[PDB]
Amino acid sequence: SGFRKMAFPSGKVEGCMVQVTCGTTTLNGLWLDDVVYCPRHVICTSEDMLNPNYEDLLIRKSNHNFLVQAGNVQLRVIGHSMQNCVLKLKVDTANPKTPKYKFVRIQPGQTFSVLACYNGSPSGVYQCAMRPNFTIKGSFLNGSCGSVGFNIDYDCVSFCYMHHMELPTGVHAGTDLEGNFYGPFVDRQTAQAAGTDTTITVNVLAWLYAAVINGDRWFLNRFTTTLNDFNLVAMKYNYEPLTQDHVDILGPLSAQTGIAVLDMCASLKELLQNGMNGRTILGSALLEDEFTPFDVVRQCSGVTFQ
């Protein structure tokens, strides 16, 4: 038993982290086969940050202007190009530690692990959700850009996030590995704010099932609700609409516990309207929305990765 916010093992990604320096700026890059992927703002000076013309700046760069290091080893850059907000640096050496991998654009509500890195070296690993407003609630300092987020399935690493910037609330924004931002953000030091966020309803339901599986059942009531009536309540409390797709995805947990999804919806309705009265669920005083249904099943069934 027990339920923790658990990250994927990071070893396969650790072997891909490198340092990229251009001029005075150093950040992290991701080395896969003979390409290093990093945020394009590595080619900026501090002054270039209000409104850089990245296409112009890169025109004046040569391969030798990019210093790439894997541990102590220098990797010679033999070509370079820009794809949206990422640079692709071709190097003369293929990474011998390249895992089986894919590039994926994740959907809001989905979770992934972040391997926080500085100077090409890993600092720590933690699990995040793509928020409905296309931010993540991370932990990132100067020099962390190019740190990546990923999921693992069996032996395949699906890279889904590259870190680029921090927004006023202390929340974080970045791109997929093709360099397209999540959300309406741009890689320049101008006034930008996250949109209003919302709570990921299907994930809260998943975590309530995890609670039942671990024996924390005080919040289960005797009622049911319709989907439409539940979503009228969810809306008032800034929760995402629950769709039939979401209900279908919760099927496995509903089957395991014998609690119909709409019965769990009635129990969540009561929590939203009445609060928890100082009680906790799985050790938490707030409702948790950063576990997907798949996260719950994988952790409660012991899925492993090779």
Ligand X SMILES: *C(=N)[C@H](C[C@@H]1CCCNC1=O)NC(=O)[C@@H]1[C@@H]2[C@H](CN1C(=O)[C@@H](NC(=O)C(F)(F)F)C(C)(C)C)C2(C)C
Tell me the one-letter amino acid at 113.
Answer: S
Cα–Cα dist 109/132, whole Å:
6
**What residues have CB less than 8 Å from 82, skipping those under 6 apart?**
40, 54, 55, 58, 88, 179
Between 69 and 88, how does the x/- string for binding to a second copy read (CB under 8 A)? --x-----------------
Rg of the Cα trace of the chain? 22
Query: Cα-Cα-Cα-Cα dihedral of 98, 142, 20, 84, to 10°?
Result: 80
Find the part of the chain contacting ligand X (CB under 6 A) among 29-37, 94-102, 188-196, 241-249: 188-196
The site for ligand X, by CB under 6 A, has a size of 20
Q: Which is nearer to ligand X, 197 or 229 (CB)?
A: 197
Among 112, 90, 117, CA closest to 17: 117
184 binds, among a second copy, ligand X, none (CB under 5 to 8 A by kind): none
- 213 part of the interface to ligand X, by CB under 6 A: no
Cα–Cα dist 40/88, whole Å:
9
- 5 part of the interface to a second copy, by CB under 8 A: yes
145 binds, among ligand X, a second copy, none (CB under 5 to 8 A by kind): ligand X
3-state SS assignment for residue 176: coil
- 272 part of the interface to a second copy, by CB under 8 A: no
Beta strands, E only, 76-183: 77-83, 86-91, 100-103, 111-118, 121-129, 148-153, 156-167, 171-175
150-189: which residues touch a second copy (CB under 8 A)? Answer: 166, 170-172
Between 156 and 185, how does the x/- string for binding to ligand X read (CB under 6 A)? ---------xxxx---x-------------
The site for a second copy, by CB under 8 A, has a size of 54
Instruction: State the minimum distance, in angstroms, from the CB of residue 169 to a second copy.
Output: 9
49 binds, among a second copy, ligand X, none (CB under 5 to 8 A by kind): ligand X
Cα–Cα dist 114/300, whole Å:
22
3-state SS assignment for residue 214: coil
- 299 part of the interface to ligand X, by CB under 6 A: no
111-130: which residues touch a second copy (CB under 8 A)? Answer: 115-119, 121-126
Instruction: State the minimum distance, in angstroms, from the CB of residue 86 to ligand X.
Output: 12
132-151: which residues touch ligand X (CB under 6 A)? Answer: 140-145
Phi-psi region of 41 (alpha: psi -120 to 50; beta: other; left: phi over 0): alpha
Q: Annotated active-site positions, please?
A: 41, 143, 145
Interacting residue ranges for ligand X, rule: CB under 6 A: 1, 27, 41, 49, 140-145, 165-168, 172, 187-190, 192
